[PDB]
């Protein structure tokens, strides 16, 4: 007699992980970037760059 074409089956599980990193900003160099108080010459200065 002939043979029937078998086929398989499997169930795989997702194994979960996570990686994380971080940095930090100084309080001194904080107000130099965001704050819109710097009017005329402190927007294009060397310290802000």
């Amino acid at each position: 007699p002939a043979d029937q074409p078998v086929h398989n089956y499997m169930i795989k599980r997702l194994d979960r992980r996570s990686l994380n990193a971080a940095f930090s900003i100084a309080v001194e160099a904080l107000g130099l970037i965001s704050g819109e108080n710097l009017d005329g010459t402190h927007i294009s200065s060397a310290m802000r760059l």
């Binding site: 010459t41 402190h42 200065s45 060397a46 310290m47």
Partner: peptide, 17 residues
Amino acid sequence: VIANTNLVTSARVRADL
């Protein structure tokens, strides 16, 4: 006034005096 190395070569208050 913050400059780079670029170069060229009232009111009436009450007080005692």
